[PDB]
Structures are given as C-alpha cells and as structure tokens.
Amino acid sequence: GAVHGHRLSTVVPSSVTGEVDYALADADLAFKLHYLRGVYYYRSGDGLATKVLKDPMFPWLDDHFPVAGRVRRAEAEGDGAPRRPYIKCNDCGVRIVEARCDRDMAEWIRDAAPGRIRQLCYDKVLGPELFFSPLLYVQITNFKCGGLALGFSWAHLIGDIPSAATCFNKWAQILSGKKPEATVLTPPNQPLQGQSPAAPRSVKQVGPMEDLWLVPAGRDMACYSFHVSDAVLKKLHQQQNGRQDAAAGTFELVSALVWQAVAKIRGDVDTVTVVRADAAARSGKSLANEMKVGYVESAGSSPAKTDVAELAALLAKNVVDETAAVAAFQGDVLVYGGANLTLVDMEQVDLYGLEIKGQRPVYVEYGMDGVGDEGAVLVQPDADGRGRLVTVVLPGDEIDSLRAALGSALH
C-alpha cells in the first residue's frame, strides 16, 4: 500500500507580472531553513478531476505572485560578505504532483504508523539548485475508496503557517465559486539595522550555508501525529483547582503534557522554545512571518518529575519574548528543533475551512521538515473544534518510547 504514479506539472499566474522583485523581510530570512507539510484528507473525490483542481490556481496565483516566484540573490556593491536574497517574481510556477494510492484511506488515517505525511506531501526543499527550486508543491493523490488527500508542502521562507492556511483557503474559496478576501502585499519589506550579533538562547546558530537551505539532522526523524480527545482535556483541568492563573487551558496544558512525556524519556529538557502563532501581533499582510518566538526556563524542579499544572503555569507567565532578536540576527538561525524542543501554538488557525465545493475536510494534519535534533510539538485543532491534534516530530528513537509514556495519560 504505497503511493505510486507521480506525474508532475506546473501552474503559472494568469497575468504577466513582469520585472518585479519581492523584497524579503528580516524575519523571513530567519525561518528560511524550515518547511511545512500539510495533508488535507477528503472523503469523496467525486467531481474533482485534475483539471477542476488546477484551473482555479491561475486566478489564485495572480493575487499571490511571490508564491510563483523563485529565490535569487542581490549584489554586493560594498563588502562582498552579505548577499541578501529576494523573491524575483518571474512566473515560474507551482508544482502539481498527481499521484494515486491503493490503500483504504479511512484505515490509513486511523493507523498510527510513524510517517504518513512524508508520502502524501512531495518530499522536496529549496535544494542544490536554489535558483530553480519551487516554493510550493501540491500533491493531489486519489485513493482506492474515492478519497482525496491534498498535500501542500509550503516553504517557510515566503510565508508563515497562518499565512499559509489562509493562502490555501483563498484557493478553496475560488474553487467553491465565492469571492476571496483581497490580499495585502503593498507595503514593501525594508531591512532594518541595529547591530545585534549575539545568538538568542531560543535558537541555535548553525554554520553558514550557501546553496542548500536544509540542515541534515543526523538522526532519522518521523512525524507521529496522535490525538487529544475531549474527556482528557477535562481530565487535565482537575489539577487546576485551588489556584487561578492566566494559563490558557487548551494549549499550555497539552504542551506541558508532551513536555513531561519527553522529559521522562530524554535527560533534561531544561529550556523549551514556545512559538506562539498569535493573532493580535499579525499585520495586514498575507505573506509575512509574525510568530512570537520565546524560551521558558525551568527555574526550579526538573520537568521529568513535576505535575502538569506547574509546567502549565510556567509555560504561560514565565515566557521571555525574543522575536525581535531572531529577526535582527545576521547568520542562519534554525528555530524549530535547533536549540530546544519547540512547542508550536497552531491552534487558533482555521485549518478546517478548506471547503472545496461544499465539503468540509475529514482530517487535517500539519507536519514539518528541516527540524533540528531536538523535536517539535504542533498542537493543532480538531474537526469538531473541541479536541486537539498533537503532531510531534521526533528522532524516531524517542517515538516508540513516547507512545508508552503517553498511554497512561490518554487511556
């Protein structure tokens, strides 16, 4: 039951943009080594050929012409050491990988094998040909039972994750025949100075790379995406009686649960990175990196022998904000998994609004790539809006020991 029959094709914008250069911000270049992997599972792929899915991308990429561009490099008139990249908006295209699989989709969703996102998204990166590598691959696989799994592999250079999910929703609304919300690209991104050469302790400054924007992690990592139900969320709030605090009891509880489960395995994850995808700090732009990178110290007991409510009260009040120093850094950064175990807060993002014609998706998971040797925790929302879907990227050695330790907490 493997995915076979890959046919590759491109979709260009419908309007000639011309000699336009999109300038990347100082925060867009700190998140350039990571990549997003998103699978949107549908029940019935009836009425959805590989023409009615490709034809709305020609008016969709007209609004989002930097997504159809390619990475280039500016010239150095002074010192020849810095060469700031930019997205030259030549309409090169977006790869469409038609595929098909012979397995039943409803069995493969509830299968819990390590690695399902790796085969339904097209496994690629801004690779050795940096000037000819696409920024988005869409894999449209059809199943034997009639299922459809759209695999979006979004490069984290050009956009955010809440700037990617809405960028896909503005294609689903064009496919449904609605009117999409107008994109905002008109304020040009300007580089700012400030001379901060110190590495912040939430990231890990890797060596200088020039033509392959991917750090090889060494350990073979895999995306294990389990689920957090409704009755365990109320079973996580029973330790939050007798004390009142500002801990939001739907992200900082389950992320403290996975923090305790990973501290039970590893030696000491004393500090962790919290990358909140907050909606209040967002500007009006549709392709920009407004994340809130931080770090939380332990400042007391170890996270392995601690209750979950203490690691929940610690993860909310005692976060130290450092999203300005990461964007003001000069080298290569590697936020996700580089220095510490990152805990993403992708839970207020509207993932289940990819209504193709009138079909709400069945199951939506976001995996990643380019994560370093520590791991990542992506706390996603469920279809009903009351459960949480926790995708944990881990080096594989710590995956089968995570399912044993989390079995006593999820029952």
Binding site: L8, T10, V12, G18, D91, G93
Partner: protein
C-alpha cells in the same frame, strides 16, 4: 461602331478570371491557462536533461529568440516529462480548429451546407481519417464536397492552401471555400539532445486560423480583401536547399526537425528569388524603369553601379513577414529598407504568440486590423517560407475600412502593444 462591339464585350467578360474575395477569417486565441514563460521552460528543460550543454544552448536561443511571456503550449507539454500520445494530440486538433471555425460561423452567418471546397493544411500531424474529414464529421457538411488535406509542406503551406482554393474557385462558380491553416505542437516535441534539433522546441507555439474565401458577386458588399496575386517559388532543386530543413532520427531514435547551419544563406536566396519574380507584378511603372532605362546604362558604362534595390514601400502599405525568427526579419528589414513602423506586426506577433507555423500571417493581419491601420484601398503583402525551401507570397487588396473593435485575437491586449522588446531576456 455599333455591331463590332459585343464581339469584344463578350470575350473580355468571359476570358477574365473570376475574382476571389476574402469574406472573413478567425484566429484562435489560446487561453491564459496554457502560457509558458521563460523560467517555466528553462526549469522544465533543466529537469529533463542532465548535460549542461543542452540547456545552455536553449537559454541562448530563447533569451534572444524575441518571444514573450504569453506564448502558449498545448496541455501535454505542461507535464515535466511531456507525453505525446495520439489521443492527446487529436484532442488538441479538436480544440484549435473547432473553436476557430465556431468563431468564423458566428461572424459571417456561414450555414455549413454552403461550404463547397475545404482545404486543410497541417505539416506533421495527419491521421488516417484526415483533419478535413474531422471537420466534415463535426459540422455535418455535404457528401459532394471537394476536401483536400495538404500535409508535409512545412511552414509555408498557408499560402499553398490559398492558391489551391483560388484555383478551385475559378473552375466551380458560385462557391465558398473554407481554408484552415494550423499546427499541432503535441507530436512536434523532440525528446532527444541533439543541438540542431532543439530549435523547433523553443519557437513553435499554438495557433490556428480558419479562412473563408468566396468567388460570388454577392460577397462584394461584405468582404474585406480581394486576392490579387499568389507567387510560389520552390527552391527544392538545389541539394543545399532541400536538406536544409530536414526531418531525421537521432542516435537514440527520436524524430525531429534537423535545421542546417547555413539556413540564413539559403533563406536569403529563396527570398531574393521570390521578390524578383513578384517585382514586375506589384511595383509601379515609375519604379519598374530600372530595367530599360537604368540597366541599359549598366552593360556598357560600368559593370557594377551603386546598389539599388527597388523600394517596395511605394507598392505596398502593409507588410506581413512570417514570424520565423528575429534574425530573418532583421535581415529582410535591411534589404528592402523597411521602416520601423512597417515591421511592427511581424515583430509583435512573434512577441505575443510565438512562431505559429502555418498561420502566423493571419495574426499579423489581425494586428493591422485591430490597430485601425487598414484603410480602404491598401495593399497587403504576406511572405512565407517553409521546409523544401519554398517561399510563397500573396498580395491582397482591402475593400472596406475595418473598424477598430474587431473581436479578434488581439482585442484584450491591443491597448498595451507595441512594446519595447529587449535584445537579451535576462536570466
């Protein structure tokens, strides 16, 4: 006299040839979901091949070819390995043709039981039920029709079908003739890596034109042009000019067009031997007096005068040079000393649509019609050159001044043209 008058007035009206009018024509405008930019082509050919000598040649070809960002390829060369099937190429011939005749039967009111002659030319693609039989099957034409299907005649078979429908309209009185000139790009792709068969990959794009000719007298208050002369020159007797454009198979077994290295010294001799035989037909009498008034002072005064090419700008008001490449139109501009405005349709058609093989002359005519430059009484010159070394030419003459909204292939981007085209498209 009073009785030796009908003996002249009944021979002069019976020995004259029948006039052949151009009622209307429709050109296929390919959609925006088929365009191939420069970077998309140079990413496809960079992912297909491995040797960097087969992509650094196509980069230098395409960045100086003169094409633009709106040139369209059929929906089988948009895959990363292109898959030319026979159903995939027949479904393109049912698209560029059946939507160019549906545009023609809506602007002339052509009832399909009135088409008496049907000539369809296409160079490479020719099935065993031909394209003319496909057009007969789709529109349900008559059973006593005169259908011909010219195939294998190259990029100059657009003015062979015009000559054929001209010579069939003299025999059959009160008839209409449908002329379809097309090129199917899906079986034209070259899979190999020989560096002289890659030039038809970088130039040939989609496009087809359906043409309705008629010799009736009722089509004089409705037609636009009148066919004056058609001059054909077949340079295939020379062995250099016959094997110049040639279809071969390389060492791996892929078919394709093998352009010779001396094509510019061969096209320059088939054009000068077609201009020479069209000179006495179209030049004014004040300019045809270099033969018996100036060449009489060439044979005894001095063998070799200052070089005097006769200027054709007094004979013609519109030029429609076939958009083969940018190097063949710069050469024909230095020879005839054409203005930069006289060569504008032949450049903007190459820039917008590309090198559509048999039907580029009709896009070049729709450019002059869409700008409002086609006055009444103007004379149009259409030059075309093909593969056995043919260089056919045809002269039209406009009958009524065409208004500026034409519903042709140009009317969504004619407010933007002419554009400044660069020498090197930057990569």
């Amino acid at each position: 006299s009073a009785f030796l008058v009908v003996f002249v007035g009944t021979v002069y009206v019976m020995s004259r040839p029948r006039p052949v009018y151009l009622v209307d024509y429709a050109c296929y405008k390919p959609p925006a979901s088929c365009r191939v930019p420069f970077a998309t082509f140079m990413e496809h050919t960079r992912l297909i091949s491995d040797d960097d000598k087969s992509v650094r040649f196509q980069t230098r070809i395409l960045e100086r070819s003169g094409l633009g960002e709106d040139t369209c390829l059929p929906p089988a060369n948009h895959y990363i390995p292109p898959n030319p099937s026979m159903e995939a190429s027949r479904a393109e011939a049912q698209l560029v043709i059946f939507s160019a005749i549906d545009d023609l039967v809506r602007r002339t009111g052509l009832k399909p039981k009135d088409i008496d002659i049907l000539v369809v030319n296409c160079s490479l693609f020719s099935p065993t039920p031909s394209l003319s039989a496909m057009i007969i099957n789709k529109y349900k034409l008559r059973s006593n029709i005169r259908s011909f299907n010219l195939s294998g005649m190259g990029c100059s078979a657009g003015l062979i079908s015009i000559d054929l429908a001209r010579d069939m309209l003299q025999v059959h009185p009160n008839s209409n003739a449908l002329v379809v000139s097309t090129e199917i790009i899906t079986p034209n792709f070259y899979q190999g890596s020989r560096r002289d068969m890659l030039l038809p990959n970088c130039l040939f794009r989609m496009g087809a034109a359906a043409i309705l000719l008629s010799n009736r007298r009722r089509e004089a208050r409705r037609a636009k042009y009148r066919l004056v002369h058609v001059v054909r020159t077949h340079k295939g007797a020379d062995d250099r000019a016959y094997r110049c454009v040639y279809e071969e198979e390389d060492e791996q077994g892929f078919s394709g067009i093998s352009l010779s290295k001396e094509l510019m010294a061969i096209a320059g001799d088939a054009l000068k031997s077609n201009i020479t035989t069209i000179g006495p037909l179209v030049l004014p009498m004040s300019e045809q007096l270099l033969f018996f008034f100036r060449l009489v002072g060439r044979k005894l005064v001095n063998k070799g005068w200052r070089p005097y090419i006769p200027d054709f700008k007094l004979a013609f008001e519109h030029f429609c040079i076939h958009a083969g490449g940018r190097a063949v139109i710069d050469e024909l501009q230095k020879n005839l000393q054409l203005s930069p405005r006289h060569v504008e349709a032949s450049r903007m058609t190459l820039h917008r649509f590309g090198n559509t093989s048999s039907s580029s002359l009709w896009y070049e005519l729709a450019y002059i019609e869409a700008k409002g430059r086609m006055r009444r009484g103007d004379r149009v010159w259409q030059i075309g050159f093909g593969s056995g070394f043919k260089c056919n030419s045809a002269v039209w003459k406009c009958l009524r001044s065409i208004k500026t909204p034409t519903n042709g292939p140009w009317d969504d981007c004619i407010h933007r043209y002419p554009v400044d085209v660069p020498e090197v498209v930057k990569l």
